[PDB]
Amino acid sequence: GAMGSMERASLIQKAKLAEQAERYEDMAAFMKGAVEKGEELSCEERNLLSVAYKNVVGGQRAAWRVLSSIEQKSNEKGPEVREYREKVETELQGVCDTVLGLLDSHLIKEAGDAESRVFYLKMKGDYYRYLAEVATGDDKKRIIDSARSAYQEAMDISKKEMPPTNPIRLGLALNFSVFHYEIANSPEEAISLAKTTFDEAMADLHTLSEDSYKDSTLIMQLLRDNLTLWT
């Protein structure tokens, strides 16, 4: 790879530079290169990896939604809208395949603290979920099962190893509930998981850490918005 000759420390340093420059494609390439050195990522470095690929794929998802919406209205003009939509779809799938391959090849493992292991399995579920949003057919059913399995395995870890207010546990629970509702056509499972997560966090508020209180509350805020939307 183009990053194979660069020192790990320099890849992290340039990733932070690319984040300040809002150069998210660059930031992702640098962190992929750092992951491929084969050493573990710290929490701060995991955040760099997450921010980088979420910005890239998030932009493709938004674009795909705009294009898909325009495509729907020729059921209300040539192949160009479909062609261009398929092009963005293919790029989105390539980036998701890239994140999943890194997760499988380098990041998911038995070692590390629960935050790391829960973070990587959560991320695996998210990127299968993003693939599911655009998949169409026998491919899609497999993708949905893969997202579910990743989320559940992450969920088991977080419940055994983390307090109910841990921001990573909450964010995992939030996204899993989104998966149930938007992807797996399981609204009841979504409300129940969202409610139980919110409730058990509220009953165990003493486990909050000042360095992560703001993060925890934002996810709880979002669980409540989601329940308000879903009920």
């Binding site: 993060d215 934002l218 996810i219």
Partner: peptide, 9 residues
């Protein structure tokens, strides 16, 4: 649309 965890920090 439902809300997922945001791209924070």
């Amino acid at each position: 649309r439902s809300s997922s965890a945001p791209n924070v920090h």
